[PDB]
Design a protein around this ligand. Structure first.
Ligand code: A1H4E
Length: 538
């Protein structure tokens, strides 16, 4: 009767709690709201979604409140994976809470865990550094949990190795935050130590990590020699090919099967010497074809003297977004090509056969001419195969929405690529979150050429495009908590456009969701965006 156990909100209080619980994870609760959540804490234990709000209400400095908070945490209806990500941010230091996050995160399968791993490696920054160190030879934390899943899953192990090694080689971290640099060095050692206690298969997996590392080391050596060559591009290409061709010297053309770092499920036995060339751009990245196990080939870009990490983040988010859309039965024919940094200054990208829209205009005059040339169909829309046009409309819609949310700038027509199957996709994420090389970038990154490709503002393709934009936008809004919680874990990352304003990064994504609007209003807003953009184009 003086107890809180049985307090029961009326209809009006329930409606106010439902508002508070439905807030996005970034919304700061007022003192009034905090008091209200606390008051009906026992009532809220039936709501998994109320737990993150509850934990934001605890005065941790009051021993009384802290103990009861942890009692309730144990009794709460269990938190979902997407929400556990919030507990791994810099806001939470409480050991029990952080371990609870891991306990709930463990419920994810390996497929989902891989979609979040990049962020989870950043989140080690917010863990107990002493505990990580003390686990070295003289209820899991995050470090123990990741290593434990990696020991049992060679894909996870592969990405854990590379994500952590890049952190280990970050000279910015080393100079600016030596304790954090030291922590990542300890994670690597903890991972090695764990692998060495494993069975024979795990010890072999470990040795194949090492074999990848030395393969990349040798590729770095090769690129230094090529980039230092005095002569023209043809001479550099000859030197690139000769060095690749000399397996005795460089051990790059024929090696024992190792996982491709970029895609570890694909095993490779070296690089084809004679088809390796440099791109005609200032930093001289190479196009390399890998020899795959089944006798096939896998083209990549290997960049040296260039930081891929912003592109790595964005392609990892695009991958996530595509997966979420597919989860809701929407396949918009996207191209989330792989990107993996092997250091702060080099890395791999998956090369997709394609043509820049600039070159399409130059060689064929328009996107539609391109399609009519390569996919003619007498009775298809504007003489184009229906499947191809369908793929074009879908992929256009998908990228329209995704680049809008991510604030992707520098959208010149060499950064929009097209395939002959009709896929359009974006590359080159050097400007994100509203940045652009020229002033006043538009909210939506649509161009005349793209609209004309689908037959103009008077076609049914155009209507299908707008519809697909609406649908994609509503689906991605439904995953706003997940997406925002993932960006929250990136705030301290050495990624240029985040590091400009760490504290405003998440807001810049969140605003694009227009969470303040209902689904009906959201559709209207998106319609209005597309109309305004396209109107301004003509
Ligand atoms: C890898 C992805 C997907 O497959 C197609 C090419 N793509 C590109 C992505 C990217 O960010 N930049 C690219 N270009 C190519 C034009 C010259 C500059 C630059 C690079 F890498 F060569 F330096 C290409």
């Amino acid at each position: 009767s003086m107890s809180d156990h049985d307090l029961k909100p009326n209809a009006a209080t329930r409606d106010q709690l439902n508002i508070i619980v439905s807030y996005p994870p970034t919304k700061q609760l007022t003192y009034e709201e905090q008091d209200l959540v606390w008051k009906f804490r026992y009532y809220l234990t039936n709501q998994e979604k109320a737990l993150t709000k509850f934990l934001k209400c605890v005065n941790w400095d009051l021993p009384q409140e802290a103990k009861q908070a942890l009692e309730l945490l144990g009794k709460w209806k269990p938190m979902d994976v997407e929400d556990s990500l919030e507990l791994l941010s810099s806001h939470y230091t409480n050991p029990t809470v952080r371990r609870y996050a891991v306990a709930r995160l463990r419920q994810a399968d390996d497929e989902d865990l891989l979609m979040y791993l990049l962020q989870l490696v950043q989140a080690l920054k917010y863990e107990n550094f002493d505990d990580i160190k003390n686990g070295l030879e003289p209820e899991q934390d995050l470090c123990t949990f990741l290593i434990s899943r990696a020991c049992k899953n060679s894909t996870l192990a592969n990405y854990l190795y590379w994500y952590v090694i890049v952190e280990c080689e970050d000279q910015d971290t080393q100079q600016r935050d030596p304790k954090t640099h030291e922590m990542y060095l300890n994670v690597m050692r903890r991972f090695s130590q764990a692998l060495l206690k494993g069975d024979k298969s795990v010890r072999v997996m470990r040795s194949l990590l090492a074999a990848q590392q030395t393969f990349v080391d040798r590729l770095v050596h090769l690129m230094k020699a090529v980039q230092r060559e005095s002569g023209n591009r043809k001479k550099k290409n000859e030197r690139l090919q000769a060095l690749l061709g000399d397996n005795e010297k460089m051990n790059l053309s024929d090696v024992e099967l190792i996982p491709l770092p970029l895609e570890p499920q694909v095993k490779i036995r070296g690089i084809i010497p004679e088809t390796a060339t440099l791109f005609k751009s200032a930093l001289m990245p190479a196009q390399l074809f890998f020899k795959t196990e089944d006798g096939g080939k896998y083209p990549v870009i290997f960049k040296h003297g260039d930081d891929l990490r912003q592109d790595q983040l964005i392609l990892q988010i695009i991958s996530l977004m595509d997966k979420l859309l597919r989860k809701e039965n929407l396949d918009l024919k996207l191209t989330p090509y792989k990107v993996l940094a092997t250091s702060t200054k080099h890395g791999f990208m998956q090369f997709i056969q394609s043509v820049p829209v600039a070159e399409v205009l130059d060689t064929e005059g328009s996107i539609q001419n391109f399609f009519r040339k390569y996919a003619p169909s007498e009775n298809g829309p504007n003489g184009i195969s229906a499947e191809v046009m369908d793929t074009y409309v879908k992929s256009c819609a998908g990228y329209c929405v995704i680049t809008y949310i991510l604030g992707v700038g520098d959208r010149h027509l060499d950064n929009l690529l097209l395939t002959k199957t009709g896929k359009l996709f974006h590359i080159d994420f050097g400007y994100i979150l509203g940045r652009d090389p020229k002033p006043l970038p538009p909210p939506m990154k649509l161009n005349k050429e793209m609209v004309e490709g689908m037959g103009g503002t008077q076609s049914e393709q155009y209507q299908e495009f707008r519809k697909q934009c609406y649908t994609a936008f509503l689906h991605l809004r439904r995953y706003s908590n997940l997406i925002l919680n993932l960006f929250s874990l990136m705030v301290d990352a050495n990624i240029p456009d985040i590091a400009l304003e760490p504290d405003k990064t998440v807001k810049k994504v969140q605003d694009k969701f227009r969470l303040d609007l209902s689904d009906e209003e959201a559709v209207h807003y998106m319609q209005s965006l597309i109309d305004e953009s396209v109107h301004a184009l003509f």
